[PDB]
């Protein structure tokens, strides 16, 4: 079983830069290597075959070369949509083996997050468990600190954070923090606030609500 080794594992560049992803082989795959772009939530879309030939619909920035044990894939001018995981596949010996992957993430100018605090729904409150949500809509870099304050109490524990991947048009991340509280514990307090610390934010931004 030919083992394909992909290098690097994660690459970061800016809009307009070049990117090189190399694939190594256990044996000698005579130009029997193809490349696949898997975007978040989609299926691997083939971009290059026969090491060099490009499938129809693939931009000109994408190019590939290689032979034997060393193979290379190159994006000339990395644009924001090209954020995806790229795989190399052999077709010299069955079974066709893939690579480990390379997550090519783009670099964006520092952008401040937009904060929104959604209180729980009265339907959920009737269900016996309420959930307060905090939202950071468009921020780069991905690093951000979300802090829940209930009745001016810095509460840590019930929170759970989920971050989207880099947007294919703005290279902007988005974060959501979900505080889950029982209906009885939620009705004990009044002020519910979410404080955000980020690079683009010179001062932490607190969005609050009261029940």
């Amino acid at each position: 079983d030919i083992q394909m080794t992909q290098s690097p594992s994660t690459l970061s560049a800016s809009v307009g830069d070049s990117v090189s992803i190399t694939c190594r082989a256990s044996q000698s795959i005579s130009s029997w290597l193809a490349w696949y772009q898997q975007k978040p939530g989609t299926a691997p879309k083939l971009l290059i075959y026969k090491a060099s030939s490009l499938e129809s619909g693939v931009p000109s920035r994408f190019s590939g070369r290689g032979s034997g044990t060393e193979f290379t894939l190159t994006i000339s001018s990395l644009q924001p949509d090209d954020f995806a995981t790229y795989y190399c596949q052999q077709y010299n010996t069955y079974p066709w083996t893939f690579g480990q992957g390379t997550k090519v993430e783009i670099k964006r100018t520092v952008a401040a997050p937009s904060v929104f605090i959604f209180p729980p729904s009265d339907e959920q409150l009737k269900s016996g468990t309420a959930s307060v949500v905090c939202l950071l809509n468009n921020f780069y870099p991905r690093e951000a600190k979300v802090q829940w304050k209930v009745d001016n109490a810095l509460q840590s524990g019930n929170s759970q954070e989920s971050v989207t991947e880099q947007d294919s048009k703005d290279s902007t991340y988005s974060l959501s923090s979900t505080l889950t509280l029982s209906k009885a514990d939620y009705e004990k307090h009044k002020v519910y606030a979410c404080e955000v610390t980020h690079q683009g934010l010179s001062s932490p931004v607190t969005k609050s609500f009261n029940r």
Binding site: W32, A34, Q89, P95, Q124, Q160, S162, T164, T178
Partner: protein, 226 residues
């Protein structure tokens, strides 16, 4: 248009069998120029080729040696459906299973080659666990410039849930966050969208959530409440 659509279960009890079907549209599975393969991807991992089925029973199966003991691939020409069966299913087969096609040909030097996996399918998410299925509960995240609203999909198993906005009409600003496994063993997801504050009174908004494993499709209207 050759279109592959993977359809099957989501929850399969451990040490059972995995009946997956790939419906082929706009193509002939009985063609000698089409090779149909099954490729799985464990969540957060690489890709693995399970096997291939190609005519010219003329069905010469070519599975992967790694999974040969339990894999069984077939083709139904009456429904144009490629079937995959995997036995003694452990939790390591928890993955998204894909169905692909390879237009095989002969090069100038006389080589049976292929230009890669041309057409791919959407992928069926199979979660191997004994936990019973659970339909989600959809709740509205109401808006209080560019305002924000969304929908909270809570308590659902297994994965995934598909969330569209306005029946596929609203796409810009739609951020569907990944699911987070709560402390209760059930999943939870949030899908938001930033709309202009004036659009609160010019367009109504509905989150279309579809949980296929439990056949739970619910559309909830996000409404500014006072």
């Amino acid at each position: 248009q050759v279109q592959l659509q993977e359809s099957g279960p989501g929850l399969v009890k451990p040490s059972e069998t995995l009946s997956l079907t790939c419906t082929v549209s706009g193509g002939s599975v009985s063609s000698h120029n089409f090779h149909w393969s099954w490729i799985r991807q464990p969540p957060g991992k690489g890709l693995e080729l399970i096997g291939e089925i190609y005519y010219s029973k003329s069905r010469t199966t070519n599975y992967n040696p790694s999974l040969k003991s339990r894999v069984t691939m077939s083709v139904d020409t009456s429904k144009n459906q490629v079937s995959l069966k995997l036995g003694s299913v452990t939790a390591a087969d928890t993955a998204v299973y894909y169905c692909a096609r390879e237009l095989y040909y002969y090069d100038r030097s006389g080589y049976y080659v292929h230009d890669g996996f041309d057409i791919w399918g959407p992928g069926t998410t199979v979660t191997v666990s004994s936990a019973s299925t659970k339909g989600p509960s959809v709740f509205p995240l109401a808006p209080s410039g560019t305002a924000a609203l969304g929908c909270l999909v809570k308590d659902y198993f297994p994965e995934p849930v598909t969330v569209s906005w306005n029946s596929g009409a609203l796409t810009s600003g739609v951020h569907t966050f990944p699911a987070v496994l709560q402390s209760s063993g059930l999943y939870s997801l949030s899908s938001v969208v930033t709309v202009p504050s004036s659009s609160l009174g010019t367009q109504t908004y509905i989150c279309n959530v579809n949980h296929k494993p439990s056949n739970t499709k619910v559309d909830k209207r996000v409404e500014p409440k006072s």
